[PDB]
Amino acid sequence: LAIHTAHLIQPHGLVVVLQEPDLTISQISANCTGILGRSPEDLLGRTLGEVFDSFQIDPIQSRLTAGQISSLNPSKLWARVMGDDFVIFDGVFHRNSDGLLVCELEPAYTSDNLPFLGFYHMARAALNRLRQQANLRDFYDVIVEEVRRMTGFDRVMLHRFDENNHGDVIAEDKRDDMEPYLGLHYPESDIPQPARRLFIHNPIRVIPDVYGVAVPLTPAVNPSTNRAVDLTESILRSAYHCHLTYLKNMGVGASLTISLIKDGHLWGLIACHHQTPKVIPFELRKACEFFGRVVFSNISAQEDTETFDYRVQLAEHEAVLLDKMTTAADFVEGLTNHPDRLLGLTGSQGAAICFGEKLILVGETPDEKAVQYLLQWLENREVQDVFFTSSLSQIYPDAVNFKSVASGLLAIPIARHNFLLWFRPEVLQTVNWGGDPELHPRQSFDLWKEIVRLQSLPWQSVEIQSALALKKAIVNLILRQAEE
Amino acid sequence: AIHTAHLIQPHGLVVVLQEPDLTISQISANCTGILGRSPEDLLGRTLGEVFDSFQIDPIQSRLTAGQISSLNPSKLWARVMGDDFVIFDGVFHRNSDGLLVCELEPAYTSDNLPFLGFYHMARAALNRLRQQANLRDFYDVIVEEVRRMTGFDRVMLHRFDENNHGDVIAEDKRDDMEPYLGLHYPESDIPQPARRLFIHNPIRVIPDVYGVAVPLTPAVNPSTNRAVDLTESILRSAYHCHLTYLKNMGVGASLTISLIKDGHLWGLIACHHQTPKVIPFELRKACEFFGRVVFSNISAQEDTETFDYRVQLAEHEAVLLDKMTTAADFVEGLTNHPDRLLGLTGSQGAAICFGEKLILVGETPDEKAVQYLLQWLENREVQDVFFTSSLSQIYPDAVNFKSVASGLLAIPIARHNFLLWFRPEVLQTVNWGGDPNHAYEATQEDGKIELHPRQSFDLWKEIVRLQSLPWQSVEIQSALALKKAIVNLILRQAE
Ligand SMILES: *[C@H](C)[C@H]1/C(=C/c2[nH]c(/C=C3N=C(/C=C4\NC(=O)C(CC)=C4C)C(C)=C\3CCC(=O)O)c(CCC(=O)O)c2C)NC(=O)[C@@H]1C
Ligand SMILES: *[C@H](C)[C@H]1/C(=C/c2[nH]c(/C=C3N=C(/C=C4\NC(=O)C(CC)=C4C)C(C)=C\3CCC(=O)O)c(CCC(=O)O)c2C)NC(=O)[C@@H]1C
């Protein structure tokens, strides 16, 4: 039933389209009858000034309004509705991709005492707590905790993205009684690349009533465009029923989502859920926007420093291996006497050393027969620098059999036939999520699981370079030995 | 300057490899002195032949950047005429022109050095940094720990301001070396080329400042009939202009680490040595990675502090909106909390012309000059808000009170009423005082200080006269908020 071509409006706010240069309402959201007590037929054709009874809005007239909008962007228009209640609205003007003038009106009130300053004071105090954390875990756990405190959502969670753009719920705070989603991985597909790239322009997604019935504009077709309006710019853009389904059968009544953007690419989300509907005012969205920026700034700081700590540990292995490789009469015998360090050098779980005729297996590797066949294959490939794959099963079909040990392989040709190999198993650390058994998280997880079949963790650049460093070091040692 | 005569620092060799045969099309002229074999001898030979090092199996076409990047670095060694057995670090890039280049820095041993020491100190540096309260303390630690890790006679931290003029924000040096801390240099002292180059080439090493630069022979690459672009080289010699600067500064070796945010150069870690001091591939790569994470924490600290301004400005906004409506006169509310009023736009003075009356707060010009100024503002017919970093530039009379109101932010009120904030010229926020008091340097104005820090400071000084600190976005919006509030207090004071 529900069409995918739904650029409609979440029903709590109004969208109006202003004709130029006359500044009359060319189209309006259909909920205007309820919200303004006046029908679309009544309002169609009226200038904004005449609708808002205070004539609050003073749009200085122009043939075209350009960047004058930026001035009007924080506007608090109000008009009397019922018993002279004088309902107020936060107003925000955009130019749609079609090039029309659009104004969005979210009803506002200052009933929430300490509405914005409070949030701001808690936010700085969050940032002090955050910066004083040692562990990155503790660090993440604090983000969600303090966001949830600040915001008051029934659930707040931190989503990061895999190197395949998949998902990983890396932190979470929720009611004791709610189901935990921590560790749940989900497919990249669950948030399509449009919605992602759209977070760059629209950094916050608010759905304060999930069950709210989306309303169109009337007339639906802009007169000038003879084409529908593009709500890409709107906060009130209604979300696609696909996702609402997901939320509904997850038990969600209101969402908030803060994008975490690095250098223009989406790093992760702060995804907030409420079981009850729950509105978030302009004021507090603006503050959330700014908070998420700085929160992410500290995220990327922590993430960066930790990933430099990997480079130290890999240097550590590199050094211990360079030492003991030259100590023991056979260099190979040095490597195999410190296998912890050898596997550690590329963050692998197994390895093989074919030097001349001999061949040594270390850690978790395939049976020697299957390995030998593999080496054979690699010399046929005639790899010049290095071979590495996150999914070996795809390129060497026979490796489907030992997917569980070597789905991932990195191999470096020491010589024409002498090679060094590192093996990774398919992702088995997914135990983090229950795996509990029709489009709901448990399904998404099962789908993600299907995708990661035959597939190891990705070979990080630092790991590869640290293996190349060992290869070149070995070659040089052998040359010196001959020269010796 | 423009001509960019592409020469080489003389300690290392640059070769240009023809493809697909990997023969040397061009070589640096120092090859005679360093390899004991002449350019005539070496030109045409494959690299493998010269350095007894595995010549890459002759590529199907050209060396893919995978093959090029896996090669980096490679240790090449050769015996040459006279028993000479010499080790080089080799490092391959392809030019913007596409041609392949290899640079050979003489090295001490054959086997790799993982810089474990450096890495252990770096790890420990980052723990120190994360535990720092003040941003100053924070910066001061960077330089200190870099200097420890690296062992330079001097390390300093340069941050660029909103026009890219330099500011030496931190520094660690030998006790009896001259301090450059607080020095501000004009953006010109690092030309926009060198800057835009740091985003692609993050590290600059000049281990011999006095070394005589050598060219390639032939100078003209046969494949381009064009001289060769060394932009991508480590061994690219720096322009004599800058070497002069270093020489007259007493430098024997320089290292520089770019600090890049969002693809724009934020600042430098500029390292100086009195003696020559080389930095190997290995240790550059470690430095490169260190500077990234160091900067990552810098931008984290910088960001959080600048959002602390947003909270404090919200705080002023709220207290001012409260007390403005409490006291019967809104003006009387503003003047009872002047700390908060100046604080709202991070200014040092303010003026309130409502109707007839006019109230000066903090540091402002004399009433006569202010009154003339208000007059001027009505003539401007300011629509939303007026703000300028240098008022003296557009209102000439303001040259007189430059030292109080070089910067002005004004919000007009109808009936000729106005709110003003004043900022002083930025000459007292920073007082490096490189010239001894009123040094009579002008006497004997032969530009003797040509290419000298002091000169740069005097140049920068000339640029920043008549000029306040820039009006930050947050500050303007906080003032607009007060404008809207005042308009809505005039409306509610209907009487
Ligand atoms: C439809 C066939 C597919 C689809 C489309 C779709 N998804 C989104 C947006 C989001 N989806 C998620 C996913 C999750 N949120 C959670 O809390 C969890 C459990 C931990 C998951 C898996 C998220 C975070 C978003 C964006 C954030 C938000 O709540 O706004 C959209 C865009 C909707 C819009 O217009 O903003 C679309 C179109 N989702 C599916 O599940 C199908 C595979
Ligand atoms: C020549 C007419 C002008 C000029 C050109 C120029 N400068 C650079 C590079 C740098 N200049 C500096 C400046 C300083 N370094 C310091 O230590 C200090 C004192 C605190 C100053 C003022 C710096 C940091 C650099 C870049 C870092 C480095 O050492 O590499 C270049 C580029 C040289 C190259 O090819 O890499 C050029 C062409 N410099 C002048 O002083 C003239 C105004």
Nearest CB partner across the interface for B315, out of A117, A293, A475: A117
Rg for chain B (alpha carbons), in Å? 29
Q: How far apart are CA B9 and CA B254, in angstroms?
A: 12
CA of B359 to the centre of ligand 2 (A): 49
Q: How far apart are CA A217 and CA B386, in angstroms?
A: 39
Q: What are the structure tokens assigned to B55, written together?
A: 């010549």
Residues 6+ apart with CB under 8 A from B379: none
Q: How far apart are CA A140 and CA A158, in angstroms?
A: 8
CA of B158 to the centre of ligand 2 (A): 12
Alpha carbon B225 to chain centroid, angstroms: 36
Tell me if the bond preceding B73 is cis, omega within 30° of 0.
Answer: yes
Whole-number Cα distances in Å, A440 to A75, A396, B170: 40, 35, 54
Q: How far apart are CA A198 and CA A403, in angstroms?
A: 37
* Residues of A (99-118) whose Cβ lies below 8 Å from B: 116-117
Our mutation pick for probing the ligand 1 site, out of A169, A246, A266, counting the most ligand atoms within 8 A of Cβ, is A246
Q: Do A407 and A425 touch, CB atoms closer than 8 A? A: yes
Q: Where are the domains of chain A?
A: 14-107, 117-210+252-304, 328-483
Q: How far apart are CA B343 and CA B350, in angstroms?
A: 10
Q: How far apart are CA A385 and CA B250, in angstroms?
A: 44
Q: How far apart are CA A48 and CA A255, in angstroms?
A: 31
Q: How far apart are CA B315 and CA B323, in angstroms?
A: 12
Question: Which of A348, A349, A376, A372 has its CA nearest to residue A360?
Answer: A372
Q: Can you tell me which residue has the tokens 């290392």?
A: B12
Alpha carbon of B482: minimum distance to chain A alpha carbons (Å) = 13
Question: Which of B224, B166, B162 has its CA nearest to residue B190?
Answer: B166
Residues 6+ apart with CB under 8 A from A84: none
> How many other C-beta atoms are found inside a 10 Å radius of the C-beta of residue A398?
13
Q: What are the structure tokens assigned to A168, written together?
A: 């990983």
Q: Fold match between B13-107 and B327-427+465-492? A: yes
Q: Do A109 and A88 touch, CB atoms closer than 8 A? A: yes
Residues 6+ apart with CB under 8 A from B93: B68, B100, B101, B232, B233
| Residue B18 burial class via C-beta count within 10 angstroms: exposed 0-12, middle 13-18, buried 19 and up | middle
Q: Mind spelling out the 3-state secondary structure of chain B?
A: CCCCCCCECCCCEEEEEECCCCEEEEEECCHHHHHCCCHHHHCCCEHHHHHCCCCCCCCCCCCCHHHHHHCCCEEEEEEECCCEEEEEEEEEEECCCCCEEEEEEEECCCCCCCCHHHHHHHHHHHHHHHCCCCHHHHHHHHHHHHHHHHCCCEEEEEEECCCCCEEEEEEEECCCCCCCCCCCCCHHHCCHHHHHHHCCCCEEEECCCCCCCECEECCEECCCCEECCCCCCCCECCCHHHHHHHHHHCCCEEEEEEEEECCEEEEEEEEEECCCCCCCHHHHHHHHHHHHHHHHHHHHHHHHHHHHHHHHHHHHHHHHHHHHHHCCCHHHHHHHCHHHHHHCCCCCEEEEEECCEEEEEECCCCHHHHHHHHHHHHHHCCCCCEEECCHHHCCHHHHCCCCCCCEEEEEEECCCEEEEEEECCCCCCCCCCCCCCCCCCCCCCCCCCCCCHHHHHHHHHHHHCCCCCCCCHHHHHHHHHHHHHHHHHHHHCCC
Q: Per DSSP, what are the bridge partners of residue A89?
A: A77, A107
Q: How far apart are CA A352 and CA A365, in angstroms?
A: 8
Q: Can you tell me which residue has the tokens 């979300």?
A: A239
CA of A15 to the centre of ligand 1 (A): 24
Q: What are the structure tokens assigned to B494, written together?
A: 């209907």
Tell me if the bond preceding B222 is cis, omega within 30° of 0.
Answer: no
Q: How far apart are CA A461 and CA B160, in angstroms?
A: 31
Q: Is the Cβ atom of A239 under 6 angstroms away from ligand 1?
A: yes
Residues 6+ apart with CB under 8 A from A158: A140, A143, A144, A169, A170, A171, A172, A268, A269, A270, A271
Tell me if the bond preceding A219 is cis, omega within 30° of 0.
Answer: yes
Domain A14-107, CATH 3.30.450.20 — does that match? yes
The answer, for B307 touching chain A at a CB cutoff of 8 Å, is yes
Q: CA angle, corner A94, sides to A89 and A96, nearest 5? A: 130
> How many other C-beta atoms are found inside a 10 Å radius of the C-beta of residue A440?
14
Sign of the C-alpha dihedral computed for residues A205, A206, A207 and A213 taken in this order:
negative
CA of B190 to the centre of ligand 2 (A): 5
What is the dihedral angle through the alpha carbons of A104, A105, A110, A111, rounded to the nearest 10 degrees? -120
Q: Is the Cβ atom of A96 under 6 angstroms away from ligand 1?
A: no
- Do strands B226-227 and B357-362 pair parallel, antiparallel, or not at all (unpaired)? unpaired
Residues 6+ apart with CB under 8 A from A378: A387, A411, A413, A419
Alpha carbon of B293: minimum distance to chain A alpha carbons (Å) = 6
Q: How far apart are CA A277 and CA A41, in angstroms?
A: 30
Q: How far apart are CA A119 and CA A106, in angstroms?
A: 20
> How many other C-beta atoms are found inside a 10 Å radius of the C-beta of residue B495?
3
Q: Mind spelling out the 3-state secondary structure of B94-125?
A: ECCCCCEEEEEEEECCCCCCCCHHHHHHHHHH
Q: How far apart are CA A310 and CA A365, in angstroms?
A: 24
Q: CA angle, corner A173, sides to A169 and A174, nearest 5? A: 110
Q: Per DSSP, what are the bridge partners of residue A106?
A: A90
Q: What are the structure tokens assigned to B81, written together?
A: 């005429």
Q: How far apart are CA B404 and CA B425, in angstroms?
A: 7
Query: What's the CATH fold of domain A117-210+252-304?
Result: Beta-Lactamase (3.30.450)
Inspect the interface and report whether the beta carbons of B112 and A309 lie closer than 8 Å. no
Q: Do B317 and B346 touch, CB atoms closer than 8 A? A: no
Compute φ and ψ for A333, nearest 5 degrees.
Answer: -65, -25
Q: Which residues of A touch B318 (CB under 8 A)?
A: 117
> How many other C-beta atoms are found inside a 10 Å radius of the C-beta of residue B96?
10
Domain B116-213+237-304: state its class: alpha beta
Whole-number Cα distances in Å, B13 to B21, B183, B215: 20, 36, 10
Resolution (A): 3.7
Residue B353 assigned ligand-binding role: no
Q: How far apart are CA A273 and CA A151, in angstroms?
A: 11
Nearest CB partner across the interface for B70, out of A116, A300, A468: A468
What is the dihedral angle through the alpha carbons of B367, B368, B369, B373, rounded to the nearest 10 degrees? 90
Q: What are the structure tokens assigned to A22, written together?
A: 């006359």
Nearest CB partner across the interface for A120, out of B297, B299, B311: B311
Q: How far apart are CA A164 and CA A159, in angstroms?
A: 14
Whole-number Cα distances in Å, A478 to A330, A331, A474, B104: 10, 9, 6, 22
Q: Can you tell me which residue has the tokens 């460093």?
A: A469
Residues 6+ apart with CB under 8 A from B274: B153, B174, B177, B250, B251, B252
Inspect the interface and report whether the beta carbons of B300 and A305 lie closer than 8 Å. no
Q: How far apart are CA B223 and CA A443, in angstroms?
A: 59
Q: How far apart are CA B362 and CA B343, in angstroms?
A: 11
Nearest CB partner across the interface for B111, out of A294, A311, A477: A477
Q: How far apart are CA A157 and CA A135, in angstroms?
A: 18
Q: How far apart are CA A354 and CA A413, in angstroms?
A: 9
The answer, for A95 touching chain B at a CB cutoff of 8 Å, is no
Q: Mind spelling out the 3-state secondary structure of chain A?
A: CCCCCCCCECCCCEEEEECCCCCEEEEEECCHHHHHCCCHHHHCCCEHHHHCCCCCCCCCCCCCCCCHHHHHCCEEEEECCCCCCCEEEEEEEEECCCCCEEEEEEECCCCCCCCCHHHHHHHHHHHHHHHCCCCHHHHHHHHHHHHHHHHCCCEEEEEEECCCCCEEEEEEEECCCCCCCCCCEECHHHCCHHHHHHHCCCCEEEECCCCCCCECEECCCECCCCECCCCCCCCCECCCHHHHHHHHCCCCCEEEEEEEEECCEEEEEEEEEECCCCCCCHHHHHHHHHHHHHHHHHHHHHHHHHHHHHHHHHHHHHHHHHHHHHHCCCHHHHHHHCHHHHHHCCCCCEEEEEECCEEEEEECCCCHHHHHHHHHHHHHHCCCCCEEECCHHHCCHHHHCCCCCCCEEEEEECCCCCEEEEEECCCCHHHHCCCCCCCCHHHHHHHHHHHHCCCCCCCCHHHHHHHHHHHHHHHHHHHHHHHC
- Do strands A265-274 and A155-161 pair parallel, antiparallel, or not at all (unpaired)? antiparallel
Q: Which residues of B touch A385 (CB under 8 A)?
A: 66-67, 69-71
Q: Do B69 and B91 touch, CB atoms closer than 8 A? A: no
Q: Per DSSP, what are the bridge partners of residue B18?
A: B23
Alpha carbon A392 to chain centroid, angstroms: 27
Q: How far apart are CA B111 and CA B435, in angstroms?
A: 50
Sign of the C-alpha dihedral computed for residues A443, A444, A445 and A446 taken in this order:
positive
Note the maximum CA span of chain A: 101
b/e per residue, B281-298, with b = 16+ CB within 10 A? bbbbbbbebbbbbbbbbb
Alpha carbon of A75: minimum distance to chain B alpha carbons (Å) = 10
Write down the architecture of domain A328-483 according to CATH.
2-Layer Sandwich (3.30)
Q: How far apart are CA A344 and CA A341, in angstroms?
A: 5
Q: CA angle, corner B285, sides to B135 and B102, nearest 5? A: 145
Compute φ and ψ for B357, nearest 5 degrees.
Answer: -60, 160
Q: Do B15 and B34 touch, CB atoms closer than 8 A? A: no
> How many other C-beta atoms are found inside a 10 Å radius of the C-beta of residue A114?
11
Q: What are the structure tokens assigned to B404, written together?
A: 């109080």
Write down the architecture of domain B327-427+465-492 according to CATH.
2-Layer Sandwich (3.30)
Question: Which of B71, B14, B19 has its CA nearest to residue B42?
Answer: B14
Q: What are the structure tokens assigned to B379, written together?
A: 């003539």
Q: Can you tell me which residue has the tokens 């006790």?
A: B175
Q: How far apart are CA B341 and CA B333, in angstroms?
A: 10
| Residue B261 burial class via C-beta count within 10 angstroms: exposed 0-12, middle 13-18, buried 19 and up | middle
Q: Can you tell me which residue has the tokens 């969402």?
A: A255
Q: How far apart are CA A412 and CA A375, in angstroms?
A: 11
Q: How far apart are CA A81 and CA A75, in angstroms?
A: 19
Write down the architecture of domain B13-107 according to CATH.
2-Layer Sandwich (3.30)
Tell the residue nearest (CA) to atom 42 of ligand 2.
B189
